[PDB]
C-alpha cells in the first residue's frame, strides 16, 4: 500500500521520511534565507529565497529567518516554502499520494493546528492527515507504555506523564527554554572573552560551538572553582576563517541555564524541578512507575552529562527509596521521528487519519475534534 509520509516540524530541524523507515530520509535546518546585497554580476541567476542546506551553504550572503519559534509557526509563507522543499526536493514525492503524519508540541495555540491542516488539504491536497504530540511518540520510540517524557527541542521543553497509555493532561508542564535560548545566552557570555557574534549567519557558528564543546557540570560550583583555578577545562575551536577561539568555564555555564533559568532572567524552575513537579501532580499509585522511565528526548538533551545531572538532582527531591531511572537512548535526537514512524504504520491507526472527505464536510475545526 501507499506509505504515509512522516514529517516532524521542529523549530530547528525538519525530519522527514516514509513510515516504516527506521530513520528519517531528509534532515535539514528549517531555515529560509533571502539575499541582502546588491546583485552586481548580470546573468548569475538570482533566486528570491533559499531553504535548508541551500541557505546554510550561502549563509554569508543571506539573512536567515527561522519561521517557527517556540513551536509556534510565526509566518506561514516561509513555512509553506519549507514544506514545498520537503515534499518536492528532499523526499521527491508527490504529496497527492501519501498520508502525512505531522507533529506538534503540546499546549500551544489552536490556530496553529488549524492552519497546519488547512495548508495540507488546500495547498498540497494530501489525501489524509494527522497531528501528534511530540512527547507521545518518544514512548513508541522507546518501547514503553508508561513514563514521563522530558522532551526538549530548539524551541520548547515539555513534560508529558503517560501511564499505561493514558495521558494525564493536567500534569503536563511546558517550559519555554530550549536550544535557541541557550544559543543566545552563549553569545552573550562569549562576549566576555572578547569574541562577539552578532549576525544571524554568525549566530549559527555559535550553535555549532554549543553542540561541539558544551557539557553539563555534575556540580556547578565545584567545576566553577576548578576552571577558575586550572586551564584543564579550557578548550579551543576554529571559526570558518581560521581564527582560533578558546573557551573555558563558559562551556559548562550555558547548559546550566536549563537547571537555573534565572541566568536568562527566566522566573521558572529548571527541567529537573519541573519534572518532579510533574510527577507530584499524578496520582500516588503511579508515581513509582513514573520515577522509573524518565525518558529523555530531543536534541537539547544531547549534552554530555545531562542524564547524570538529572538523576542526581531528582534523587535529591524524590523520597530516599524510590528508584530514579533516566532513560537516554543515543538516538534520542530522532526518537520523536522514530515513534511517528511506528505510529503511522500500525493498522489500528488507519482509521484515525483525517480524510479529505471529513475536512470538506467539517472544515479545519475537525482537527480538535478528531485528535488529541
Amino acid at each position: 500500500e501507499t506509505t504515509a509520509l512522516v514529517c516532524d516540524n521542529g523549530s530547528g530541524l525538519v525530519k522527514a521520511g516514509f513510515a516504516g523507515d527506521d530513520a528519517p530520509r531528509a534532515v535539514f535546518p528549517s531555515i529560509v534565507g533571502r539575499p541582502r546585497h546588491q546583485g552586481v554580476m548580470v546573468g548569475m541567476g538570482q533566486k528570491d529565497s533559499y531553504v535548508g542546506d541551500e541557505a546554510q551553504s550561502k549563509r554569508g550572503i543571506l539573512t536567515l529567518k527561522y519561521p517557527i519559534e517556540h513551536g509556534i509557526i510565526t509566518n506561514w509563507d516561509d513555512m509553506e516554502k519549507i514544506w514545498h522543499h520537503t515534499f518536492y526536493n528532499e523526499l521527491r514525492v508527490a504529496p497527492e499520494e501519501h498520508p502525512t503524519l505531522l507533529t506538534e508540541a503540546p499546549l500551544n495555540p489552536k490556530a496553529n493546528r488549524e492552519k497546519m491542516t488547512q495548508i495540507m488539504f488546500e495547498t498540497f491536497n494530501v489525501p489524509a492527515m494527522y497531528v501528534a504530540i511530540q512527547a507521545v511518540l518518544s514512548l513508541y520510540a522507546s518501547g514503553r507504555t508508561t513514563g514521563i517524557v522530558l522532551d526538549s527541542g530548539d524551541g520548547v521543553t515539555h513534560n508529558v506523564p503517560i501511564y499505561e497509555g493514558y495521558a494525564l493532561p493536567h500534569a503536563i508542564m511546558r517550559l519555554d527554554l530550549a536550544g535557541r535560548d541557550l544559543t543566545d545566552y552563549l553569545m552573550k557570555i562569549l562576549t566576555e572573552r572578547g569574541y562577539s557574534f552578532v549576525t544571524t549567519a554568525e549566530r549559527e557558528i555559535v550553535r555549532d560551538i554549543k553542540e561541539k564543546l558544551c557539557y553539563v557540570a555534575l556540580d556547578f560550583e565545584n567545576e566553577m572553582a576548578t576552571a577558575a583555578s586550572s586551564s584543564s577545562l579550557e578548550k579551543s575551536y576554529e571559526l570558518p576563517d581560521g581564527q582560533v577561539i578558546t573557551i573555558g568555564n563558559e562551556r559548562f555555564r550555558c547548559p546550566e541555564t536549563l537547571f537555573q533559568p534565572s541566568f536568562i532572567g527566566m522566573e521558572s524552575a529548571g527541567i529537573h524541578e519541573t519534572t518532579y513537579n510533574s510527577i507530584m501532580k499524578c496520582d500516588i499509585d503511579i508515581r513509582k512507575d513514573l520515577y522509573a522511565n524518565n525518558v529523555m528526548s530531543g536534541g537539547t538533551t544531547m549534552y554530555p552529562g545531562i542524564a547524570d545531572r538529572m538523576q542526581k538532582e531528582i534523587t535529591a527531591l524524590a523520597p530516599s527509596t524510590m528508584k530514579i531511572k533516566i532513560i537516554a537512548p543515543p538516538e534520542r535526537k530522532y526518537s520523536v521521528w522514530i515513534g511517528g514512524s511506528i505510529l503511522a504504520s500500525l493498522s489500528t491507526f488507519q482509521q484515525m487519519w483525517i480524510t479529505k472527505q471529513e475536512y470538506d464536510e467539517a472544515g479545519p475545526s475537525i482537527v480538535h475534534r478528531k485528535c488529541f
Binding site: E69, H70, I72, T74, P109, D176
Partner: peptide
Amino acid sequence: WXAXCPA
C-alpha cells in the same frame, strides 16, 4: 505568541 511572549 500573541501576548505573553514574542511568538
